[PDB]
Design a binder for this molecule. Structure first.
Ligand SMILES: *[C@@H]1O[C@H](CO)[C@@H](O[C@@H]2O[C@H](CO)[C@@H](O[C@@H]3O[C@H](CO[C@H]4O[C@H](CO[C@H]5O[C@H](CO)[C@@H](O)[C@H](O)[C@@H]5O)[C@@H](O)[C@H](O[C@H]5O[C@H](CO)[C@@H](O)[C@H](O)[C@@H]5O)[C@@H]4O)[C@@H](O)[C@H](O[C@H]4O[C@H](CO)[C@@H](O)[C@H](O)[C@@H]4O)[C@@H]3O)[C@H](O)[C@H]2NC(C)=O)[C@H](O)[C@H]1NC(C)=O
Ligand SMILES: *[C@@H]1O[C@H](CO)[C@@H](O[C@@H]2O[C@H](CO)[C@@H](O[C@@H]3O[C@H](CO)[C@@H](O)[C@H](O)[C@@H]3O)[C@H](O)[C@H]2NC(C)=O)[C@H](O)[C@H]1NC(C)=O
Ligand SMILES: *[C@@H]1O[C@H](CO)[C@@H](O[C@@H]2O[C@H](CO)[C@@H](O[C@@H]3O[C@H](CO)[C@@H](O)[C@H](O)[C@@H]3O)[C@H](O)[C@H]2NC(C)=O)[C@H](O)[C@H]1NC(C)=O
Ligand SMILES: *[C@@H]1O[C@H](CO)[C@@H](O[C@@H]2O[C@H](CO)[C@@H](O[C@@H]3O[C@H](CO)[C@@H](O)[C@H](O)[C@@H]3O)[C@H](O)[C@H]2NC(C)=O)[C@H](O)[C@H]1NC(C)=O
Ligand SMILES: *[C@@H]1O[C@H](CO)[C@@H](O[C@@H]2O[C@H](CO)[C@@H](O)[C@H](O)[C@H]2NC(C)=O)[C@H](O)[C@H]1NC(C)=O
Ligand SMILES: *[C@@H]1O[C@H](CO)[C@@H](O)[C@H](O)[C@H]1NC(C)=O
Ligand SMILES: [Zn+2]
Lengths: 199, 595
């Protein structure tokens, strides 16, 4: 097998035709490739490009042992919760970032992609959970949340709710309720040979 | 788990399902109102049936949580609002019949056409055609023809529908434990469980009837003044003692006397006009009207209109491709979707109505922060008054001079201020007896007080008695003339426009103190006062979370509606009208009628 370097598959994540629900968020491990973060631009107007602990302008001169790209879709007014030190339905039960997060959060409006006149109920999120999510934890359990004191026996009903909630994105919604595609780049530096570098 | 934590979790799950169903029902209703088709009707029916069957089960489930152990008040409020007299359980057969009556009356009003007796192809609708004749014509015969043709062809069409409309609306109200549909609408103002701030359904009838009696003197003098200036315009058609013919009043029903200004200006020639002409001269657009209204709300700290508002609203007549309900309305569909539906012409009437409807939307946006069940105005009067306290400021010559519709050097002498106060009186004061009588007739018809065989004998007995306006043609009981108004045939409560008219001058008085205005109220313009907008916004953001008595007392200092500020606003005109009716008669007798 030959010594040839790959070009980092950032197009597989940022340009996926369908993103995951935030409760079941995708993670792609980027490794053993040359990353060119210079292609990450020209998203929907007034997108968010929010980095923490690393400068995105120096990114093309840095090396890391691994890079992780987590992707999902959320509501417009939930975007602020995808950052360190945040509370809310998303940061508490669906996707959590730690205080020492070193990485970037790219989030852009996807109303033209993910909204439907009949409503897009495919994108969902967890509305009830017994406790807060640990950072980078993923929960995909469809177990009936028991709000009351009677057991639910896996049946939705009085005080027994199905824990996931569909967004139902429609294009005529306001921006706070419109869908936003989100990609979370995590740059990891370990005691190991750095295998993701810029040009 | 405590009952409160369970009630919270129930309300959370409720709000996410309710917002999605409310949006579908709202959007279905929008599609019908902008575009009247048989397919859009049954879509509105299906989305409305799903929405009520949802409330049917949710209001039942909400009984499982007793209020007496909810310590968090805002949780208590959502629970109360969900089990409260909104069951609207009707049988499937009777629920479908009331909808057919409602949809038919709705379709007839907006698509009703009077056609040439000799040429069936050329017809006039109410909105583009007949309104122009009733607002701009000066021929006695032409106005009479339009007044009668609309009430004879469309009015008679609505008479049998309205009779069965009340027998079903009354049956619905009784199943929800009200005396009648009129008591149901009155329940909008009801407040109980709050010491000193409570307000009953019956207390509105007393407060409207007594506040209106304090209004009788001011309106009777304006009535006599308009009578004299109308005597000049029309040779032998009006006597100095009789009522005012109903087809000469400025619009289709005489709801406002605003278009009578051209005939009644006290000082008309020498003071520059305060009306539409300069808009047309400056080639103003329906977009310019709303952009100027948007500019006004922003100047007090309120937000812009959303991007979706401009993309999704219908702000001009769509044409003959679709049949639209052209009457100006404001829409809060939820999910950040705000729209106005209005067939905007380039008039000063439409310019001020833009401020009215945008006032609704600004209220909707302000209390969007509330829980779903509390997103509404304090009462219907509050909602219909927000745009009016801005219209008060935008109508003043100070503001029109600063937005370029009056000369850059305007002479604001003693005389131009009386012109302003009169035109303000033609609209605001003129609509008060019209409003009170119409709603009182509905209440009296909803209640068992006006039988079928004399529905129009009493409607005109109350027009001549209370309003001072007489039928030019005798109408038998085949006619239904109140239903020829948008709000009556479209199932809207009308007393909202009476209570708001007192509310606005109360609010405007408090807001002009916030902006440190110096003179009498009618010179006040709150345009660039971000402090005045702050006082207003701190109430708009509340929604239905506080009773209207407390929300009103925390801004104006009065737990109730009051007539004082309205009368201070019009005092210079009140003492001026007295001087003009020296050799005239103030009042009228019911014993005179053309035919
Ligand atoms: C009656 O009950 C209600 C509800 O039970 C209660 O209101 C709650 O009060 C608690 C206070 O402990 C609030 O929790 C705090 O929230 C802080 C952040 O607030 C923002 O985010 C909230 C949730 O995020 C939502 O936002 C997005 C859009 O922004 C939305 O799509 C999602 O729903 C998402 O979940 C949001 O509710 C909140 O808005 C409320 O609060 C503001 C503030 O006044 C108000 O103006 C609004 O009108 C609205 O009522 C706001 O947008 C957060 O910083 C804080 O974090 C502390 O606690 C956590 C957990 O212990 C710690 O980890 C953290 O380090 C901090 O110490 C805390 O979580 C909760 O949000 C309120 N919920 C609601 C529905 O209002 C009332 O207080 C009760 N009344 C009385 C008298 O007790
Ligand atoms: C996701 O897909 C889009 C669409 O292909 C990618 O955008 C394209 O990326 C290339 C590479 O930088 C850019 O092309 C540029 O075109 C301009 C002229 O328009 C030219 O002057 C430049 O030299 C460059 O060739 C541009 O950003 C864009 N091209 C398009 C849209 O035509 C995007 O890179 C993909 N995302 C990822 C992460 O791969
Ligand atoms: C005014 O309202 C009418 C409703 O009667 C709209 O016409 C209908 O609009 C729907 C919604 O897009 C469409 O139905 C479509 O039917 C076709 C053929 O059966 C099919 O592809 C789908 O079943 C789809 O639902 C269609 O445009 C039309 N249906 C009719 C006429 O039967 C009309 O679009 C509205 N006007 C405006 C300007 O919005
Ligand atoms: C609320 O505040 C705005 C902004 O301060 C006021 O608009 C300003 O109006 C003055 C007077 O018209 C403008 O000054 C001068 O106007 C003449 C028109 O004859 C023209 O040569 C220039 O525009 C000149 O500056 C000023 O420009 C204008 N400012 C802006 C930003 O448009 C407005 O009059 C205030 N409204 C009230 C009711 O106080
Ligand atoms: C309200 O909207 C107007 C335009 O609709 C804003 O004015 C524009 O602001 C942008 C960026 O601030 C600039 O291009 C110009 O200053 C304005 N453009 C035009 C065409 O008028 C205004 O800033 C908005 N105000 C608020 C409070 O949202
Ligand atoms: C005009 O001013 C005179 C005195 O300056 C006053 O008597 C008169 O009432 C004023 N007219 C109007 C219409 O205000
Ligand atoms: Zn209104």
């Amino acid at each position: 097998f030959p010594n040839i370097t790959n070009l980092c598959p950032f197009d597989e994540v940022f340009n996926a035709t369908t993103f995951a629900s935030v409760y079941a968020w995708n993670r792609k491990r980027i490794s053993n490739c040359v990353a060119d973060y210079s292609v990450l631009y020209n998203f929907a107007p007034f997108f968010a490009f929010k980095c923490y602990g690393v400068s995105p302008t120096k990114l093309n001169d840095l090396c890391f042992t691994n890079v992780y790209a987590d992707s999902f879709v959320i509501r417009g007014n939930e975007v602020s919760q995808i950052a360190p030190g945040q509370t809310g339905n998303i940061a508490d039960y669906n996707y959590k970032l730690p205080d020492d997060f070193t990485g970037c959060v790219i989030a852009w409006n996807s109303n033209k992609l993910d909204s439907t006149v009949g409503g897009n109920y495919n994108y969902r999120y967890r509305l009830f959970r017994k406790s807060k999510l640990k950072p980078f934890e993923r929960d995909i359990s469809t177990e009936i949340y028991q709000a009351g004191n009677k057991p639910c026996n896996g049946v939705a009903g009085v005080n027994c709710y199905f824990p996931l909630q569909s967004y139902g994105f429609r294009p005529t919604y306001g921006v706070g309720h419109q869908p936003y595609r989100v990609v979370v780049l995590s740059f990891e530096l370990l005691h190991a040979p750095a295998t993701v570098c810029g040009p | 788990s405590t009952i409160e934590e369970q009630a919270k979790t129930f309300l959370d799950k409720f709000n996410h399902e309710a917002e999605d169903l409310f949006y579908q029902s709202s959007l279905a209703s929008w599609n019908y109102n902008t575009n009247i088709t048989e397919e859009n009707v049954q879509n509105m029916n299906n989305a409305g049936d799903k929405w009520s069957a949802f409330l049917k089960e949710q209001s039942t489930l909400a009984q499982m949580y007793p209020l007496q152990e909810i310590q968090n008040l805002t949780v208590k409020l959502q629970l109360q609002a969900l089990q409260q007299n909104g069951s609207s359980v009707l049988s499937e057969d009777k629920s479908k019949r009331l909808n057919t009556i409602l949809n038919t009356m709705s379709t007839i009003y907006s698509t009703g056409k009077v056609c040439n007796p000799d040429n069936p192809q050329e017809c006039l609708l109410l909105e583009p055609g007949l309104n122009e004749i009733m607002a701009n014509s000066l021929d006695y015969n032409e106005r009479l023809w339009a007044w009668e043709s609309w009430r004879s062809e469309v009015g008679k069409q609505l008479r049998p529908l309205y009779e069965e409309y009340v027998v079903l609306k009354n049956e619905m109200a009784r199943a929800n434990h009200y005396e009648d549909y009129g008591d149901y609408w009155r329940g909008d103002y009801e407040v109980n469980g709050v010491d000193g701030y409570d307000y009953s359904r019956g207390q509105l009838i007393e407060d409207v009837e007594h506040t209106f009696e304090e209004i009788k003197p001011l309106y009777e003098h304006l009535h006599a003044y308009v009578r004299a200036k109308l005597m000049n315009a029309y040779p032998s058609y009006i006597s100095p003692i009789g009522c005012l013919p109903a087809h000469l009043l400025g619009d289709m029903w005489g709801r406002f006397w605003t278009n009578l200004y051209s005939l009644t200006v006290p000082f008309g020639q020498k003071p520059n006009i305060d009306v539409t002409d300069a808009m047309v001269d400056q080639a103003w657009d329906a977009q310019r009207i709303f952009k100027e209204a948007e500019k006004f709300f922003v100047s007090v700290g309120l937000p812009n209109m959303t991007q979706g508002f401009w993309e999704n609203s219908m702000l001009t007549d769509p044409g003959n491709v679709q049949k639209a309900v052209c009457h100006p309305t404001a829409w809060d569909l939820g999910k950040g979707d705000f729209r106005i539906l209005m067939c905007t012409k380039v008039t000063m009437d439409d310019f001020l109505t833009a401020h009215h409807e945008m006032g609704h939307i600004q209220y909707d946006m302000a209390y969007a922060a509330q829980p779903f069940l509390l997103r509404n105005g304090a009462n219907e009067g509050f909602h219909e008054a927000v745009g009016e306290i801005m219209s008060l400021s935008a109508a003043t010559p100070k503001h029109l001079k600063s937005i370029g519709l009056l000369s850059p050097d305007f002479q604001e002498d003693n005389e131009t201020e009386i012109n302003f106060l009169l035109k303000q009186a033609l609209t605001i004061v003129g609509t008060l007896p019209f409003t009170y009588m119409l709603e009182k007739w509905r209440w009296m018809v909803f209640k068992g007080e006006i039988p079928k065989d004399q529905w129009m004998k009493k409607w005109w007995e109350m027009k001549r008695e209370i309003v001072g306006v007489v039928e030019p043609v005798p109408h038998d009981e085949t006619y239904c003339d109140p239903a020829s108004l948008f709000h009556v045939s479209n199932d809207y409560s009308f007393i909202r426009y009476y209570t708001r008219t007192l509310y606005q001058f109360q609010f405007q008085e408090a807001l002009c103190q916030a902006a440190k205005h110096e003179g009498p109220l009618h010179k006040c313009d709150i345009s660039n006062s971000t402090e005045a907008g702050q006082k207003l916004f701190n109430m708009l953001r509340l929604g239905k979370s506080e009773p209207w008595t407390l929300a009103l007392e925390n801004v104006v200092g009065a737990k109730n509606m009051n007539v004082r500020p309205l009368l201070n606003y019009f005092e210079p005109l009140f003492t001026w009208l007295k001087d003009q009716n020296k050799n005239s008669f103030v009042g009228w007798s019911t014993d005179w009628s053309p035919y």
